[PDB]
Amino acid sequence: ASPFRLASAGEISEVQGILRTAGLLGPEKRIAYLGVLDPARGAGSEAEDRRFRVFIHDVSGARPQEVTVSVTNGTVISAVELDTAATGELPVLEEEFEVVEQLLATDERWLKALAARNLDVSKVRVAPLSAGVFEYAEERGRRILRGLAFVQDFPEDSAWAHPVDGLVAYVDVVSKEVTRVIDTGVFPVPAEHGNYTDPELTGPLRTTQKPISITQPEGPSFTVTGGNHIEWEKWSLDVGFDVREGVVLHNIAFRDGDRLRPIINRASIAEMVVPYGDPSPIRSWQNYFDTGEYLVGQYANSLELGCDCLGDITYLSPVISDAFGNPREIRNGICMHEEDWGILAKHSDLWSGINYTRRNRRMVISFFTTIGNYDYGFYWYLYLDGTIEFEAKATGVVFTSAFPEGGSDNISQLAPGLGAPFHQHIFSARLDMAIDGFTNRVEEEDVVRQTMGPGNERGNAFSRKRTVLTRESEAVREADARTGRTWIISNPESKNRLNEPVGYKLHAHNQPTLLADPGSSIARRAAFATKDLWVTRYADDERYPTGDFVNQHSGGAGLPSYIAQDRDIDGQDIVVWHTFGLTHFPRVEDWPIMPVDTVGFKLRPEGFFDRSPVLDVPA
Amino acid sequence: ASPFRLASAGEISEVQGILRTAGLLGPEKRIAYLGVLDPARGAGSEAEDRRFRVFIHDVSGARPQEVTVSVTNGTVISAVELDTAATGELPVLEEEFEVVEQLLATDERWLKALAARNLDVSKVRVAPLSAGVFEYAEERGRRILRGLAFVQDFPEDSAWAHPVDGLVAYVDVVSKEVTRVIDTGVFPVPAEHGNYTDPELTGPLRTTQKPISITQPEGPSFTVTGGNHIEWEKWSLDVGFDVREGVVLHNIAFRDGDRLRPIINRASIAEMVVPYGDPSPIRSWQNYFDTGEYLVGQYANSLELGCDCLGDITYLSPVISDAFGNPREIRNGICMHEEDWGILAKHSDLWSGINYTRRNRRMVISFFTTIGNYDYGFYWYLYLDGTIEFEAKATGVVFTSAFPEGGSDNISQLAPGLGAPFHQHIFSARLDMAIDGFTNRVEEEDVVRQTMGPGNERGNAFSRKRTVLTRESEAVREADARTGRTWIISNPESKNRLNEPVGYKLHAHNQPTLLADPGSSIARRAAFATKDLWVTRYADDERYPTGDFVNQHSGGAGLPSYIAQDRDIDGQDIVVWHTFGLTHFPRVEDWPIMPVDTVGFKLRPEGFFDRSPVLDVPA
Ligand SMILES: [Cu+2]
Ligand SMILES: [Cu+2]
Ligand code: NA
Ligand code: NA
């Protein structure tokens, strides 16, 4: 059967053919998003119905459509015309990458700005930047990109070293019109190159690094069946891939003795946003929803053995649609491997004389994406002891500006005249929970300090408290690192051998959440990012914390809308949405290419098992 | 030549000779501590002056002695008699491990307590548990241990499974008296065994783990010279070992071009304490200073190839003193190795067409110690990009009690009738800073949110602020995870090429600090544990946050007394003391042997370098 299998080339071609046959994919049409939908709750007991969801753009100016197709049955389930002024523009198209530059290169206003700075238009790269929603009334219902310029001295030059500050332009990418060109004044274009492969800058390459060789002479300890079903050290799951979210994990479960015990039904990064903290009008509008606006899966890198993924690696090569509905594979886009993870457990007992040491390991499922200047690695880990973890690795080249004469409270200096505006990278992990099945609840757990006094005469006692989140109205929670705050997802109907509800505990990093003023456009569009933890009642159309159409879309959709339904979440099918991010004040060490920095979260079993689940691990 | 070399067997024998000779080491004397002192500031000018410090106990009842010896010249530099009521009792002796059990075995009150519960005295283990300072006037200036009992059913049995609750004893070790026996009532002794090598409990061992082979066919990239001097990937340091602190790192420096740039003069874990949060009088006194009371260095494990340390491992075997002054080797007690650490930096540029990926690695220096039921791994990491990290890995067997009928706010259930009292493990890292030399200062850095309004019309701006800690009275700081609080150690007189002071940024995990009421004995004796970050002016006698003699010292010693001098720390030779720990509410999964959990901290360069320090890493 495998209803959770990866989309195949054939299914994508078949979706193309069904849309063509239905008159929904003529020559003016482009696919902005296409993805398989998950099986309905209660299916499987039913025969397969592989359904695909598609967002269709029209290059002639007609309204776009949202369409669901049954590839199994050869039918259109639903097709609806979108009013983008109301519900949002479609994601940025790959084919739009060059359009902002191209339109600007023959615009008199743009040419005058470049001439004022003695810049050859043929050398000026313009990034295709999402526009957001600000004060420009003509943009409402128009497909707009904003353009920031970077000089490329020659084909292999890193243009990020040479930002053109004081200049921004706005462009209607459908009508092919430049709507505005703003020039607030010339800034020096920083002169130093940032070519990290140029020997003049790297100096002589190190010869001190002796090889490290990681092999598995008997092959890996996991199996892959049905294309994407993994079995490893009692874990079971399906590795999905979506052009928006990237790698998605389905049906995470753990085989405890004879019983396959569900833990998480679906795990994904459902949004990620990069808000900038520079109040210059040149960049004060910039907030990049890498997931919702750009689609991180579509820009997943092909990962090279040795370089990207080291050891004995099993790759998946997910298939996506191009703009015309033809299938296109991302060769070696997903890495899967197990790695040693140091000591699992150890004790040398004085009274028994028994010395005991065991090694840990983890299964790693990862991909790496590139969104303009940024490159991110998304890593999911499963450990022997039942721990589940996510880690993002952020690297690439920092987004640059001029560094103002006399400094800046909102920009860092990286090189002479070269700045890097402050920003955050903020993720939302959507964890559709299934702790021992779907009947789940969430408690907030704080450490409780106790006063010295009767019953605690020495003032040493400390405790904890748990507060059940009973309805969605009560389920928008903030971190409290000082009181060791965590959140436990339990099954109130499933008890361990000590008669306590089985559970998993989410441990957050307690990094700063969204810093923008609460009255800002970004605080509304990225409302999710203002709070660390949200809990909703599962619904099949509540997929993204920002809604389906983020591009140039105001508040009105996403998590705040979902939570208003105030649904019962106390022993129901629920979804946890955890916000976590990095706050980046760039350092000189980040330039000219950034060393990886990290953020994430993990969930650990909390009386899920009846004792340590790793007593059967051999020496 | 190396003044920071490890103590050799010969040095310890030479120290032993000096003591016995001058009438300090007869049959009634026992060495409770011995170690090499670090050289004085600026001693590199003059010839070597190797001194050792010794604490000497007397089993007859005579006053203990602190003694400094010069091994290089064969003299006693000083020898002072200690008043222990005033300055503290000496560290627990290895040879006292069984004395509490033996003294109780012949005691009528104790035997009555055992007979009422039908426990065979030959099967009752009693732990030698540190006493602290409470309400018992008789104990002032006396060497006291407390006893808690655990039943061992046979030689190979884990006694931790069988706590005898409701029962505690106090013991004068020197005069061999039993001062008190408290029996608050019988609790059932939990019956299930906790023998994690018993096939009945483990079930059949897994056969699913295929090997992972990590080799270096050209050997490692680090060199070791003069016994303990490491050079690896631009790093330079010396690996010391002390019987109290364990592994100590000296002279951490980085070769930037042709200059050896100091970063940290000395790094150690200078204290670690395990306070318990159960108000039962049976345990409410218990607070185990594993470092200051027990000495974690002397209980360092011999680490086995393939089991404890995997890959190409270079070992050090530190030598320490036994109770009589003979050198005793800890074979393979320190592991040193490099390991792969994923992606270092990656960018695939749309405009330049250049794809770039580099791999990270880290140097690992570790040891593993065992303190009764606890086992801890202490790991220091140096990364290619200049990051320095410490991680503690906590494992072993949880300290147990009965689980009360009708539950507990201060104890977790692990098995039928078996409890685990809540507790913390709180570490203090003492970082004697030398950022580009000794003239340093510390700033507290908070993220700063900005209000929407003039100068920030879109309400997107955010910033940061830095507050210099100018004097020790202002230098006792708490975490604020919400505002992204960090601490930067800089050198105001050393500027990078952008004319900004060079610095390193300390990133804490912001876990809870000491939870005990501020009026408790443990808040006084482990005052360091109540705050996240302390900065003092360097003094050669200020080595530990809890003082030189922790055992039965009344409050206030160490950091609170040091900070009270209120010295200048703004551009001076300073020391950072970072408190960090684990708050442990034991889970069923921790039983019968606990999977590793971790805590730590890191420091990253912050304008220390003129650009990324890893551009010369090869593909
Ligand atoms: Cu960043
Ligand atoms: Cu613990
Ligand atoms: Na759910
Ligand atoms: Na210092």
CB contact residues (below 8 A), chain A span 344-363, against chain B? 344-354, 356-357, 359-361
For residues A155 and A160, what is the distance between their CA atoms, to the nearest angstrom? 13
C-alpha distance from B258 to closest chain A C-alpha (Å): 13
Give the position of tokens 């790759």: A315
SS3 A34: strand
Q: Which of A278, A385, A479 sits opposite B595 (nearest CB)?
A: A385
Residues 292-311 of A with CB under 8 A from B: 301, 304, 307-308, 310-311
Which residue of chain B is at minimal alpha-carbon distance from A457? B279
B584 annotated to bind ligand: yes
Expressed in Å, this structure's resolution amounts to 1.6
Contacting residues of A for B285, CB less than 8 Å apart: 458
The type of residue at B591 is W
Would the CB atoms of B125 and A351 count as touching at under 8 Å?
yes
DSSP secondary structure of A176-197 = TEEEEEEE----PPP-S---TT
Ligand nearest to the CA of B398: 2
Handedness of CA A400, A401, A407, A411 (dihedral sign): negative
> Dihedral through CA A529, CA A535, CA A541, CA A546, nearest 10?
-10
> Exposed, middle or buried by CB within 10 Å (0-12, 13-18, 19+), for B202?
middle
Helix (H, G, I), strand (E, B) or coil at A17: helix
Q: Which residue, B314, B318, B355, B320, is CA-closest to B337?
A: B314
Buried b (16+ CB within 10 A) or exposed e, A455-484: ebebbbbbbbeeeebeebebbbbebbbbbb
- Give the Å distances, CA to CA, from A97 to A30, A103, A302: 15, 12, 20
A516 to chain B, any CB pair closer than 8 A? The answer is yes
| Closest to B320 (Cα-Cα) out of B112, B587, B578, B35 | B35
- Residues B243, A435: Cα–Cα separation, whole Å: 46
If asked whether residues B500 and B567 sit together in one domain, one would say: yes
List of E strands, B37-194: 51-58, 65-70, 75-81, 124-130, 144-151, 163-172, 177-183
A274 and A374 both lie in a single domain: yes
**DSSP structural state of residue A396:** E
Cis peptide before B204 (omega within 30 of 0): no
What are the contacts of A177-181 at 24+ separation with CB within 8 A? Answer: A177/A103, A178/A103, A178/A104, A178/A107, A178/A109, A178/A110, A179/A136, A179/A138, A179/A139, A179/A144, A180/A136, A181/A104, A181/A107, A181/A109, A181/A110, A181/A113
- CA–CA dist B262, B44 (Å, integer): 15
Report whether B556 contacts B363 (CB < 8 A): no
Name the catalytic one among A238, A290, A532, A590.
A290
B147: contact with A, CB 8 A cutoff: no
**DSSP 3-state assignment of A330?**
coil
Q: Is B395 on the interface with A (CB under 8 A)?
A: yes
Both B363 and B475 in one domain: the answer is yes
Pairing of strands B287-289, B259-275: antiparallel
Partners of B214 on chain A (C-beta within 8 Å) are: 212-214, 340
Q: Which residues contact B63 (CB under 8 A, 6 or more apart)?
A: B81, B82, B83, B84
Determine contact: B184 vs chain A, CB below 8 A.
no
CB atoms within 10 A of CB A511: 22
Residues A261 and A317 in one domain: yes
Whether residues A441 and A545 share a domain: the answer is yes
Map tokens 């560094």 to a residue: A403
Q: Ligand 3 centre from A425 Cα, in Å? A: 27
Q: What angle do CA A253, A613, B582 make, to 5 degrees?
A: 105
Same domain, B63 and B208: no
Of A33, A170, A374, A504, the active-site residue reads A374
Chain B residue at shortest CA distance from A597: B344
Question: Of all helices (H) and strands (E), which one includes residue B220?
Answer: none
Query: Kindly report the CA angle at B450 between B449 and B455, in degrees rounded to 5?
Result: 155
Tokens 């069988």 correspond to what residue? B162
What is the DSSP code string of A290-328?
IIIII-GGGGBPPPPBTTTB-SS-EEE--EEE-TTS-EE
The answer to whether residues A276 and A284 touch, using CB atoms and an 8 Å cutoff, is yes
Token output for A200? 């003049």
**In the 3-class helix/strand/coil scheme, how is B38-61 assigned residue by residue?**
CCCCCCCCCCCCCEEEEEEEECCC
**How many C-beta neighbours within 10 Å does residue A199 have?**
10
Q: Cβ–Cβ of A343/B410 closer than 8 Å?
A: no
Number of structural domains found in chain B: 3
How far does A555 lie from chain B, in Å, by closest CA?
15
**Residue B381 is labelled as binding a ligand:** no
In chain A, which residue's Cα lies nearest the Cα of B277?
A: A461
The closest alpha carbon to B393, from B350, B425, B421, belongs to B425
d(CA A356, CA B593): 10
Residue of B nearest to A398 (CA): B347
Please give the span between the terminal C-alpha atoms of chain A, in angstroms, as a whole number. 38
- For residue A72, the 8-state DSSP code is T
Residue B605 to residue A431: CA distance in whole angstroms: 35
What residues are paired with A268 via a beta bridge?
A430
Q: Which residues contact B558 (CB under 8 A, 6 or more apart)?
A: B271, B527, B528, B542, B544, B545, B546, B547
A290 labelled catalytic: yes
A–B interface: beta-carbon pairs under 8 A: 443
Same domain assignment for residues B233 and B353: yes
Residue A305 Cα to chain centre, angstroms = 24
Using the mean position of ligand 3's atoms as its centre, give its distance from the Cα of residue A257 in Å: 24
Is B562 in the active site? no
Rg (CA), chain B: 26
Chain breaks in chain B (C to N over 2.5 A) after: none
Does one domain contain both B133 and B246? Answer: no
Residue B187 shares a structural domain with residue B65: no
Instruction: Verify cis geometry, omega within 30 degrees of 0, for the bond prior to B592.
Output: yes
Phi and psi torsions of B312, nearest 5°: -90, 100
Q: Distance between CA atoms of B194 and B590, rounded to whole angstroms?
A: 11
| C-alpha–C-alpha distance, residues B537 and A269, integer Å | 46
Is B423 annotated as contributing to ligand binding?
A: yes
**Do B587 and A594 lie within an 8 Å CB cutoff?**
no
- Tally helices (H) and strands (E) across chain B: 7, 34
AA letter at B382? L
> Among B195, B229, B249, where does a domain finish?
B195
Number of Cβ within a 10 Å radius of residue A48: 14
Pairwise CB contact (< 8 Å): A595 & B614: yes
- Nearest Cα neighbor of B489 from B389, B589, B612, B577 is B577
Cα(A550) to centroid of ligand 1, in Å?
A: 21
Nearest chain B residue to A454 by CA distance is B279
Three-class secondary structure of residue B467 per DSSP: strand
CB B30 within 8 A of CB B56: yes
* A230 & A168 share domain: no
Per DSSP, A571 falls in state S
Residues 460-479 of A with CB under 8 A from B: 460-464, 479
Count of C-beta atoms within a 10 Å radius of residue A119: 17
Cβ atoms of B570 and B441 closer than 8 Å: yes
B197–A211 C-beta distance less than 8 A: no
Task: Retrieve residue A404's tokens.
Answer: 């103002």
**Among B276, B219, B229, which residue's Cα sits nearest to residue B250?**
B229
Domain end call among B87, B117, B132: B87
User: What CATH number should be reported for the domain holding residue A80?
Assistant: 3.10.450.40
Tell me how the structure was determined: X-ray
- Does A385 share its domain with A404? yes
Nearest to A606 among B500, B587, B604 (CB): B587
Cα separations in angstroms, A529 against A59, A390, A513, B48, B484? 33, 17, 6, 59, 15
CA B575 to centroid of ligand 4, rounded, Å: 5
Boundary residue ending a domain (A26, A56, A87): A87
A259 touches chain B (CB under 8 A): no
Statement to judge: residues B290 and B353 lie in one domain: yes
B510 conformational bin, left if phi > 0, alpha if psi -120 to 50, beta if neither:
left
Across A352-450, the runs of DSSP E, i.e. the strands, are 355-371, 374-383, 388-396, 401-402, 411-415, 418-421, 423-433, 441-449
Q: Which of B145, B150, B149 is nearest to B170 (CA)?
A: B145
Q: How many angstroms is it from B376 CA to the middle of ligand 1?
A: 35
Among B275, B413, B614, beta carbon nearest to A460 = B275
Q: How far is ligand 4, taken at its centre, from the CA of residue B266, in Å?
A: 8
Rg (CA), chain A: 26
If phi over 0 gives left and psi between -120 and 50 gives alpha, with beta otherwise, what is residue B331?
beta
DSSP H or E segment with residue B413: strand B411-415
| Domain that residue A103 falls in | 94-195
Q: Locate tokens 């590139």: which residue?
A: A370
A232: closest CA among A431, A333, A368, A381?
Answer: A381
What does DSSP say about strands A229-232 and A29-36: parallel, antiparallel, or unpaired? unpaired
The full length of chain B comes to: 619
Q: Which of A208, A375, A519 lies closest to B348 in CB terms?
A: A375
CB of B152 within 8 A of CB of A351?
yes
CB atoms within 10 A of CB B12: 24
Written as six digits, the tokens of A246 are 């990237």
